[PDB]
Write a protein that binds this ligand. Structure first.
Ligand SMILES: *C(=O)CCCC[C@@H]1SC[C@@H]2NC(=O)N[C@@H]21
Ligand SMILES: *C(=O)CCCC[C@@H]1SC[C@@H]2NC(=O)N[C@@H]21
Lengths: 80, 80
């Protein structure tokens, strides 16, 4: 059912929506993003990987909640 | 940009995706739901309101994370 371009995790770690515990989220559903825009962060033992959009579009859905563990290739964000 | 049928909060309270702190979520993006299916819970001072689907379709997006406060009429879930 999930149609659109799916941005997947490039690593095993913990998913975060924000640049810090007190900051606002990089993106929200309905937001337009451009190639290169940071969508989220996946962290593993303090190694923090900033996941960027590989194509421009609108954020259709965010599939994981902040603080949740993600696997390699796990769907994170859908862009339409 | 958010196209589809939007299920909104009927009250001011706290949004929860699960029936208990240790349970799995009622729904996930991509899941097909039928009228009457529970999508989430909004809680205010232990008054727990189970939000049900008013139409059948596929969950396109979930707009709030568990434990976050929601306002009256705030968009919660999008059904396509
Ligand atoms: C390390 O274990 C200390 C906490 C690290 C927090 C980082 S900053 C970027 C991520 N966003 C967030 O909310 N927490 C993560
Ligand atoms: C009251 O303040 C005690 C905690 C109430 C927990 C309830 S059970 C249904 C909701 N889901 C969840 O994860 N927590 C909420």
């Amino acid at each position: 059912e999930i149609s659109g371009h799916i941005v997947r995790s490039p690593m095993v770690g913990t998913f975060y929506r924000t640049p810090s515990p007190d900051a606002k989220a990089f993106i929200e559903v309905g937001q337009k993003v451009n190639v290169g825009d940071t969508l989220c962060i996946v962290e593993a033992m303090k190694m923090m990987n900033q996941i960027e959009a590989d194509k421009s579009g609108t954020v259709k859905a965010i599939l994981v909640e902040s603080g949740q563990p993600v696997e390699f290739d796990e769907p994170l964000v859908v862009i339409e």
